[PDB]
C-alpha cells in the first residue's frame, strides 16, 4: 500500500486546508496567523536554512503543541469552536502521535509506452521548474501583477525593494523569495483587522483594507505561489541528492530544436532585450519611456557586443531604479509590468553576457540566404 506512506506524508497540505477553514472564522486576526500563516512561516523556516528543507521538526513539532494548547484553552458557538478546531487539532495531534517523519524527517536533504512518455514529460517539465525558467520568472510575474497592478503603496517591500534588485543581482534571489514570503505573511496579518476600527481620518498612500474576502484575496495567492515553487525546487533537490551545443545543430530538425530550446536567451537574449524595450515604448508612449528609448539608442550605438557588455551593469541598474521610481510615483500600473519584463530579460542577459559566454539544410537555406 503506497497510499499508507503517502498519507503519512500527507499532513502539511491536509493541515493547510483545515487552516483555510480556520481562516475567516474564529479570530479574524489571531487564528489566520497562528494556524495558516505560521505554518506558512515554518515552511519559510526550513527553506531559509537552505539545507533543512522538510527536515525542520523542532518548530514543526511545537506548532502542533501550540495548536493543542489553543484548543485546550478554548476551541452553537461553544460547540462550534470545539468541533471546528478539533477537526484540525485531530489531524495535528495525529502527526505528533505517529508518522511525523515522512513529511518532516524522511523527505530530507542530508504501465506501457504511453504511460512511459507521460512520466518522462512530468520530469522534463519539473526540470524546467527547477530551472530558472520557473525558479524566478513565473514567480516575479505574478508578484508584479499582484503588487503593482493590484494593491499599491505599501506592497513596495514585496516588489520594488526586493525583485527590482534581486533580478539584476541573483546572489540574493532566493533570500529575496524567503523574505517575500515573510513580508506578505506580515501583510495579511495586518490587513486581517481591516481598517474600519474607529477611523479618524501615518500617510503611506493609505488605501485601507475595507473589503474582507476580496481584500485578503491576492497576497495569499503569491504566498502560495512561493510555496509551490519551493515545493518543486526541493522535490528535485532531493531527486538530485538521492534518486547539444552546436553539435546537434547540424544534425537535423530535432537537433536544431534541441539546441535552441536549451540555448535561446544564451544568444538571442540581447536582441530580445532590444525588442522588449520597444515593447515598453509602445505600451506607454509617455515621457518616462523616452529614458528607456535613450538607453536603447545608447546600447544600440555600442554595436560590438563586447562594448554593450560593459554598459550592461549600468543598464540593468537604470532599469531597477526606474521600477522603484515608477512605484514611488504611483504611490507617493501596467507600465510597471512592462518595465519589469524588460528588467527581467536584461537581467538574465547580464547573467549570460559576462558569465555563460565567458532537410534541415533547406531550413538553413531560408534563414541563411
Amino acid at each position: 500500500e503506497l497510499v499508507k506512506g503517502v498519507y503519512a506524508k500527507y499532513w502539511i497540505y491536509v493541515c493547510a486546508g483545515m487552516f483555510i477553514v480556520v481562516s475567516f472564522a474564529g479570530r479574524l486576526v489571531v487564528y489566520k496567523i497562528v494556524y495558516m500563516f505560521l505554518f506558512l512561516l515554518c515552511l519559510t523556516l526550513f527553506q531559509v536554512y537552505y539545507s533543512l528543507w522538510r527536515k525542520l521538526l523542532k518548530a514543526f513539532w511545537w506548532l502542533v503543541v501550540a495548536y493543542t494548547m489553543l484548543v485546550l484553552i478554548a476551541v452553537s458557538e461553544l460547540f462550534s469552536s470545539i468541533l471546528v478546531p478539533g477537526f484540525f487539532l485531530l489531524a495535528c495531534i495525529l502527526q505528533l502521535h505517529y508518522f511525523h517523519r515522512p513529511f518532516m524527517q524522511l523527505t530530507d536533504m542530508e504501465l506501457e509506452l504511453a504511460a512511459g512518455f507521460s512520466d518522462v514529460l512530468s520530469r522534463v517539465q519539473v526540470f524546467l521548474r527547477r530551472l530558472l525558467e520557473l525558479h524566478v520568472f513565473k514567480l516575479v510575474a505574478l508578484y508584479t501583477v499582484w503588487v503593482a497592478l493590484k494593491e499599491v503603496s505599501v506592497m513596495n517591500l514585496l516588489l520594488v525593494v526586493l525583485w527590482a534588485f534581486a533580478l539584476p543581482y541573483p546572489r540574493f534571489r532566493p533570500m529575496a523569495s524567503c523574505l517575500s514570503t515573510v513580508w506578505t505573511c506580515v501583510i495579511i496579518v495586518c490587513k486581517m483587522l481591516y481598517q474600519l476600527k474607529v477611523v479618524n481620518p501615518n500617510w503611506f498612500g493609505v488605501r485601507k483594507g475595507f473589503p474582507n474576502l476580496g481584500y485578503i484575496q491576492n497576497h495569499l495567492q503569491v504566498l502560495l505561489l512561493l510555496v509551490f515553487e519551493a515545493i518543486v525546487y526541493r522535490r528535485q533537490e532531493h531527486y538530485r541528492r538521492q534518486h547539444g551545443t552546436r553539435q546537434q545543430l547540424d544534425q537535423d530538425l530535432l537537433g536544431c530544436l534541441k539546441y535552441f530550446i536549451n540555448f535561446f536567451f544564451y544568444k538571442f537574449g540581447l536582441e530580445i532585450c532590444f525588442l522588449m524595450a520597444v515593447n515598453v515604448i509602445g505600451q506607454r508612449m509617455n515621457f518616462l519611456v523616452t529614458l528607456h528609448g535613450c538607453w536603447l539608442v545608447a546600447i544600440l550605438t555600442r554595436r560590438h557586443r563586447q562594448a554593450i557588455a560593459r554598459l550592461w551593469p549600468n543598464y540593468c541598474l537604470f532599469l531597477a531604479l526606474f521600477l522603484l521610481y515608477q512605484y514611488l510615483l504611483c504611490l507617493g500600473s501596467t507600465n510597471l509590468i512592462s518595465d519589469f519584463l524588460l528588467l527581467l530579460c536584461a537581467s538574465q542577459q547580464w547573467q549570460v553576457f559576462s558569465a555563460e559566454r565567458t532537410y534541415l539544410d533547406m531550413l538553413k537555406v531560408a534563414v541563411f540566404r
Binding site: 547540424d250 532537410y359 539544410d361 533547406m362 538553413k364 537555406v365 541563411f368 540566404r369
Partner: protein, 109 residues
C-alpha cells in the same frame, strides 16, 4: 480513389513544368550545379573556390568533374519528396526560367 488520382496528376504536372524549364535546367547544371550550394555546414570554407566552381556547349559532359562530392547530394531530399515539395520546386524553376513573362503578366494584371 480521388486522392490517388490527384497524386498522379501532381506528378504529371511536375513533368510538364520540367519540360518547360528544361533548357534553363540544363543551363543551371553546367553553371549552377557548380554555383549555388548552401549546404556546407560547420565553420568556414577551407578550399574556398575549389569547393564550388570546380566541384562534382549547351549540354556539356564531364569536362570538369564527375560526381566526387555527391552530385545527388542536392537530388537526395529533392527526389525524396517527389510529391508535394517537388511540385513547388518545379513551379519555381518555371518562373525562374520565364521571369520575363511573369513580369508581363503582372503588369497587365
Amino acid at each position: 480513389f480521388l486522392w490517388m488520382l490527384g497524386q498522379a496528376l501532381v506528378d504529371e504536372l511536375t513533368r510538364w513544368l520540367q519540360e518547360f524549364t528544361r533548357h534553363h535546367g540544363t543551363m543551371s547544371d553546367v553553371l549552377r550545379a557548380e554555383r549555388y550550394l548552401l549546404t556546407q555546414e560547420l565553420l568556414q570554407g577551407g578550399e574556398v573556390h575549389r569547393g564550388v566552381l570546380d566541384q562534382l556547349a549547351s549540354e556539356l559532359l564531364l569536362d570538369r568533374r564527375l560526381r566526387i562530392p555527391e552530385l545527388e547530394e542536392a537530388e537526395l531530399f529533392a527526389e525524396g519528396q517527389g510529391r508535394a515539395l517537388r511540385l513547388l520546386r518545379a513551379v519555381y524553376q518555371c518562373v525562374a526560367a520565364h521571369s520575363e513573362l511573369l513580369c508581363y503578366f503582372i503588369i497587365i494584371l
